[PDB]
Nucleic acid binder design. Structure first.
Ligand code: NA
Ligand code: NA
Ligand SMILES: [Zn+2]
Ligand SMILES: [Zn+2]
Length: 327
DNA sequence: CATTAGA
DNA sequence: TCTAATG
């Protein structure tokens, strides 16, 4: 956790770079299990030889380890860190819409800088355009203070349209987070469940709504169950116009909201932990459901869930307020 | 791990 | 169709 800190750190830098700059999946894939194994290893690694004892730790990796060990550095790192083509790839990637594929690609043409990205808007697709467009606003953390106003709003129109519209702003803000990266609206309605062959318009109405009011400024993407957008608070009595907020709204079968709500909220650890437990209690927990286990190794039979509660009850646990869904 | 663009 | 990108 801190005993094998650097070791894992460099391993990750190292892993990462393979996978981005070079399209070296495997080397990258190497750097990770190692980076993974060595993480756990309950003893302060003092030589590569020691590491080497490890599963996933080859000769190349340890080579590095010792090097890191001796000199509080690594050449491959100093070289990478330094190197432009690489620096540029990691950079550009920051644009919403820009993964490493396109990243390398642009570089190849020489769109290393941001301005580059500008003169080359033709070269960019829709998302990527909006990426570039709210480049700053996107890097920006969302103050709860605003999460509340937004949420506020979202709730009304959700309502103004149909009263059957059940909606939850999940995520960190759900667990009292003082800020968030983007607001996530978990949405379902009674007419939509496991069975009833969809009803695309259910998601659609609402997109149109928030939009009709100006909350939704743009379309990052929009499917029949998932919509990814840009939103923004009515820049008031002016002199202070709101930053464009990243937003996501997802339509759900009502019959499987909660496991999904549970899910969406996290944290990852409460999850994995809540997830670890269900199993003991003789169950199976998923991004949408909870099934009973059957000694035959496994089982099925998706249980009836009427609240974040029921699920707990199931695995018979203490209801943990979202606020304390911390770990 | 699943959903959406897009080519 | 696959292949990228988000989450
Ligand atoms: Na080994
Ligand atoms: Na990106
Ligand atoms: Zn020890
Ligand atoms: Zn989100």
């Amino acid at each position: 956790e801190t005993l094998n800190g650097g070791i894992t750190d460099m391993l990750t830098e190292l892993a990462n770079f393979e996978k981005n700059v070079s399209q070296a999946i495997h080397k990258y894939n190497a750097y990770r299990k190692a980076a993974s194994v060595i993480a756990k290893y309950p003893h302060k690694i003092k030589s590569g030889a020691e590491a080497k004892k490890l599963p996933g730790v080859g000769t190349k990796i340890a080579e590095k380890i010792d090097e890191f060990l001796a000199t509080g550095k690594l050449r491959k790192l100093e070289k990478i860190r330094q190197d432009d083509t690489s620096s540029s790839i990691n950079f550009l990637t920051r644009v919403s819409g820009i993964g490493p594929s396109a990243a390398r690609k642009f570089v190849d043409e020489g769109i290393k800088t941001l301005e580059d990205l500008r003169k080359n808007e033709d070269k960019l697709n829709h998302h990527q355009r909006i990426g570039l467009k709210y480049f700053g606003d996107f890097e920006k953390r969302i103050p709860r203070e605003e999460m509340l106003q937004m949420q506020d709003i979202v709730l009304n129109e959700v309502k103004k349209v149909d009263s059957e519209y059940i909606a939850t702003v999940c995520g960190s803000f759900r667990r009292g987070a003082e800020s968030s990266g983007d607001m996530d609206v978990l949405l379902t309605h009674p007419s939509f469940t496991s069975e009833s062959t969809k009803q695309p318009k259910l998601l659609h109405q609402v997109v149109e709504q928030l939009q009709k009011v100006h909350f939704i400024t743009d379309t990052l993407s929009k499917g029949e169950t998932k919509f990814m957008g840009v939103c923004q608070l009515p820049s008031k009595n002016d002199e202070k116009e709101y930053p464009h907020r990243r937003i996501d709204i997802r339509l759900i079968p009502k019959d499987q909201y909660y496991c999904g709500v549970l899910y969406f909220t996290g944290s990852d650890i409460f999850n994995k932990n809540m997830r670890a437990h269900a199993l003991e209690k003789g169950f199976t927990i998923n991004e949408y459901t909870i099934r009973p286990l059957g000694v035959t190794g496994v089982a099925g039979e998706p249980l009836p869930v009427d609240s974040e509660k029921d699920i707990f009850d199931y695995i018979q646990w203490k209801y943990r307020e979202p606020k304390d869904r911390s770990e």
